[PDB]
Design an enzyme around this catalytic site. Structure first.
Site, PDB file in Angstrom:
ATOM      1  CB  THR A  40      -0.811  -0.085   1.018  1.00 38.61           C
ATOM      2  OG1 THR A  40      -0.089  -0.113   2.281  1.00 38.61           O
ATOM      3  CG2 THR A  40      -2.055  -1.099   1.109  1.00 38.61           C
TER       4      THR A  40
ATOM      5  CG  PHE B 256      -6.624   5.549   4.746  1.00 38.61           C
ATOM      6  CD1 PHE B 256      -5.368   4.681   4.715  1.00 38.61           C
ATOM      7  CD2 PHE B 256      -6.331   6.857   4.537  1.00 38.61           C
ATOM      8  CE1 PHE B 256      -4.312   5.245   4.583  1.00 38.61           C
ATOM      9  CE2 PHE B 256      -5.065   7.366   4.258  1.00 38.61           C
ATOM     10  CZ  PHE B 256      -4.102   6.574   4.109  1.00 38.61           C
TER      11      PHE B 256
ATOM     12  CB  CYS C 229      -6.662   1.973   6.797  1.00 38.90           C
ATOM     13  SG  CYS C 229      -4.855   1.215   6.914  1.00 38.90           S
TER      14      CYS C 229
HETATM   15  C1  HEM Z   1      -1.260   4.273   1.979  1.00 39.57           C
HETATM   16  C2  HEM Z   1      -1.431   2.915   2.787  1.00 39.57           C
HETATM   17  C3  HEM Z   1      -2.802   2.259   2.861  1.00 39.57           C
HETATM   18  C4  HEM Z   1      -3.845   2.265   2.284  1.00 39.57           C
HETATM   19  C5  HEM Z   1      -4.306   2.917   1.178  1.00 39.57           C
HETATM   20  C6  HEM Z   1      -4.756   1.393   3.230  1.00 39.57           C
HETATM   21  C7  HEM Z   1      -6.253   1.063   2.726  1.00 39.57           C
HETATM   22  C8  HEM Z   1      -6.877   0.409   3.621  1.00 39.57           C
HETATM   23  C9  HEM Z   1      -8.158   0.247   3.351  1.00 39.57           C
HETATM   24  C10 HEM Z   1      -9.099   0.937   1.829  1.00 39.57           C
HETATM   25  C11 HEM Z   1      -8.735  -0.530   4.207  1.00 39.57           C
HETATM   26  C12 HEM Z   1     -10.225  -1.166   4.433  1.00 39.57           C
HETATM   27  C13 HEM Z   1     -10.500  -2.367   3.768  1.00 39.57           C
HETATM   28  C14 HEM Z   1     -12.030  -2.793   3.581  1.00 39.57           C
HETATM   29  O1  HEM Z   1     -12.777  -2.142   4.139  1.00 39.57           O
HETATM   30  O2  HEM Z   1     -11.919  -4.257   2.846  1.00 39.57           O
HETATM   31  C15 HEM Z   1      -7.912  -0.842   5.096  1.00 39.57           C
HETATM   32  C16 HEM Z   1      -7.844  -2.216   6.294  1.00 39.57           C
HETATM   33  C17 HEM Z   1      -6.679  -2.246   7.005  1.00 39.57           C
HETATM   34  N1  HEM Z   1      -5.335  -1.643   6.709  1.00 39.57           N
HETATM   35 FE1  HEM Z   1      -4.824  -0.433   5.352  1.00 39.57          FE
HETATM   36  N2  HEM Z   1      -4.096   1.010   4.054  1.00 39.57           N
HETATM   37  C18 HEM Z   1      -2.934   1.262   4.151  1.00 39.57           C
HETATM   38  C19 HEM Z   1      -1.851   1.041   4.907  1.00 39.57           C
HETATM   39  C20 HEM Z   1      -1.823   0.373   6.043  1.00 39.57           C
HETATM   40  C21 HEM Z   1      -0.768  -0.066   6.769  1.00 39.57           C
HETATM   41  C22 HEM Z   1       0.502   0.560   6.931  1.00 39.57           C
HETATM   42  C23 HEM Z   1      -1.158  -1.173   7.669  1.00 39.57           C
HETATM   43  C24 HEM Z   1      -0.576  -1.654   8.756  1.00 39.57           C
HETATM   44  C25 HEM Z   1       0.698  -2.003   8.959  1.00 39.57           C
HETATM   45  C26 HEM Z   1      -2.669  -1.421   7.490  1.00 39.57           C
HETATM   46  C27 HEM Z   1      -3.257  -2.207   8.132  1.00 39.57           C
HETATM   47  C28 HEM Z   1      -4.666  -2.221   7.715  1.00 39.57           C
HETATM   48  C29 HEM Z   1      -5.794  -3.328   8.752  1.00 39.57           C
HETATM   49  C30 HEM Z   1      -5.082  -4.290   9.622  1.00 39.57           C
HETATM   50  C31 HEM Z   1      -6.910  -3.277   8.152  1.00 39.57           C
HETATM   51  C32 HEM Z   1      -8.217  -3.892   8.620  1.00 39.57           C
HETATM   52  C33 HEM Z   1      -8.659  -3.080   9.684  1.00 39.57           C
HETATM   53  C34 HEM Z   1      -9.881  -3.542  10.286  1.00 39.57           C
HETATM   54  O3  HEM Z   1     -11.075  -3.875   9.482  1.00 39.57           O
HETATM   55  O4  HEM Z   1      -9.965  -3.628  11.369  1.00 39.57           O
HETATM   56  N3  HEM Z   1      -2.874  -0.627   6.310  1.00 39.57           N
HETATM   57  N4  HEM Z   1      -6.582  -0.293   4.637  1.00 39.57           N
END
Ligand code: HEM
Ligand SMILES: O=C(COc1ccc(OC(F)(F)F)cc1)N[C@@H](Cc1ccccc1)C(=O)O
Length: 454
Positions: free
Chosen positions: A267, A392, A399
């Site tokens: 990401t 996010f 996220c």
């Molecule tokens: C620019 C960087 C990133 C973007 C664009 C991004 C985007 C997203 C998005 C759109 C979701 C929601 C997914 C869904 O609804 O199905 C998500 C969930 C998540 N992201 Fe990211 N992410 C990024 C970076 C990171 C990083 C660095 C981490 C952890 C090291 C991370 C961990 C997670 C986790 C654990 C979830 C699930 C959260 C939950 O449902 O409790 N993300 N991310």
């Protein structure tokens, strides 16, 4: 009540062959441009509705009406990310438990603790580029992925992937990239049982075993030593959920680690790649961002407080997330029967897909100039309507990494703009590769050092 449009069909395969492309999200974006704010998408045994307007998406983001759904992509990633946070249903005990335990690890306040580790890897990137010869160029997504994998390894479990020391990936990463490739290719297959995929299926089970064996050994080696590094693994071994009073078990911690490694690899590296792309294509913007970097980052080692002062750098990152949200979709189901938009009746369980790149192009929100890269759109955070900008995701299932990702990306982009001038020496034509995420494939630049010591 209205009938929604549907793209072209292929007999009994319905719309499924539309995804037989290396660029399925870009294909769905073109279908949304043709069909409008909503369209029906069918495959054998499955129906979803793709939303593109802020009008409909703001309703889909109402947590009283819709919960997170696992899209076919996420169901396939679940075969190696398990009930980690990203691939759990909201109702599974491990979702709320891990959420409660991990939230404090991922707060803006926790970023002060990770900063020094982030700087360590960022300085390795800057030194790499300072050490290139005159004739050389930078492979941008390649270097950004080296950085972001290293940062989450160090912050995740005090492990140095040492990506700047190598060409060939870590064994874990070859298995993780190959598993992500299988999960994302599998949802396109018109005949998944074809013997042509027997080898892919064998390899996938092998790759799951590799990721599990290697991460289970990281966890067991940490429990054996007793060592108390200030990393996510320590927080997970020690932390208790206030609600259940329980810690995560070792199997769930393994899924969380796999999940963080997928996120860091896929990401933030995309975001940085797209941001540098838009900067070399928009020299006025690059100058304003480089001016802020120079004025704010006055010390050879950026501080936490200095990174928070990089307002315009942050605006650049938000505008890059507007045009190319590197995680480009999320999925919802209807908790109960409900009418979307006063026009589209949904039954309990009905799925929706949010096409984030199309949301971010809604002219009724952003104005006529939606394809232009203009960080000034983000000058005034107040002025962005609720649910207009969703790179996010949404609500409690947003996220958890958002602050981590933006802290790392602001730090690194600030240091890049402080230390070098950049040239789009090939007049790079944007070519967006789709893995789990979007990244600009083959993007190369030349950096001319400003010769500022570290
Ligand atoms: C620019 C960087 C990133 C973007 C664009 C991004 C985007 C997203 C998005 C759109 C979701 C929601 C997914 C869904 O609804 O199905 C998500 C969930 C998540 N992201 Fe990211 N992410 C990024 C970076 C990171 C990083 C660095 C981490 C952890 C090291 C991370 C961990 C997670 C986790 C654990 C979830 C699930 C959260 C939950 O449902 O409790 N993300 N991310
Ligand atoms: O629309 C998409 C776009 O693909 C992605 C979905 C999630 C995703 O995860 C993340 F956004 F987090 F990166 C990445 C790409 N996926 C849909 C495609 C599909 C498949 C079969 C029938 C109907 C529809 C899906 O995965 O269900």
């Amino acid at each position: 009540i209205k009938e929604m449009p549907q793209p072209k069909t292929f007999g009994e395969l319905k719309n499924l062959p539309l995804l037989n492309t290396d660029k399925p999200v870009q294909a769905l974006m073109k279908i949304a441009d043709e069909l409008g704010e909503i369209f029906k998408f069918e495959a054998p045994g499955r129906v979803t509705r793709y939303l593109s307007s802020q009008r409909l998406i703001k309703e889909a983001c109402d947590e009283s009406r819709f919960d997170k759904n696992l899209s076919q992509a996420l169901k396939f990633v679940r075969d190696f990310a398990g009930d980690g946070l990203f691939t759990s249903w909201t109702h599974e005990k491990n979702w709320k438990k891990a959420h409660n335990i991990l939230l404090p690890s991922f707060s803006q306040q926790a970023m002060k603790g990770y900063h020094a580790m982030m700087v360590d890897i960022a300085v390795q990137l800057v030194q790499k580029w300072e050490r290139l010869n005159a004739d050389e160029h930078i492979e941008v997504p390649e270097d950004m992925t080296r950085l972001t994998l290293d940062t989450i390894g160090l912050c995740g479990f005090n492990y140095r992937f040492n990506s700047f020391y190598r060409d060939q990936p870590h064994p874990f990463i070859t298995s993780m990239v190959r598993a992500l490739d299988e999960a994302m290719n599998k949802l396109q297959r018109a005949n998944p049982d074809d013997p042509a995929y027997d080898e892919n299926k064998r390899q996938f089970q092998e790759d799951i075993k590799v990721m599990n064996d290697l991460v289970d050994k990281i966890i067991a080696d940490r429990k054996a030593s007793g060592e108390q590094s200030d990393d996510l693994l320590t927080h997970m071994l020690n932390g208790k959920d206030p609600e259940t009073g329980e810690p995560l078990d070792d199997e769930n911690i393994r899924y969380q680690i796999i999940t963080f490694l997928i996120a860091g690899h896929e990401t933030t590296s995309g975001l940085l790649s797209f941001a540098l792309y838009f900067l070399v294509k928009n020299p006025h913007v690059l100058q304003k961002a480089a001016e802020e970097a120079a004025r704010v980052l006055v010390d050879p080692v950026p501080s936490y407080k200095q990174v928070k002062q990089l307002k315009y750098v942050g605006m650049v990152l938000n505008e890059a997330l507007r045009l190319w949200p590197t995680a480009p979709a999320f999925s919802l189901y209807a908790k109960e029967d409900t009418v979307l938009g006063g026009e589209y009746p949904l039954e309990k369980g009905d799925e929706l897909m949010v096409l984030i790149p199309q949301l971010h192009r809604d002219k009724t929100i952003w104005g006529d100039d939606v394809e232009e890269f203009r960080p000034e759109r983000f000058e005034n955070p107040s002025a962005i309507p609720q649910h207009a900008f969703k790179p996010f995701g949404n609500g409690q299932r947003a996220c958890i990494g958002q602050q981590f990702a933006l802290h790392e990306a602001t730090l690194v982009l600030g240091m890049m703009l402080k230390h070098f001038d950049f040239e789009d020496h090939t007049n790079y034509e944007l070519d967006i590769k789709e893995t789990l995420t979007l990244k600009p494939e083959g993007f190369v630049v030349k950096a001319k050092s400003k010769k500022i010591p570290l």
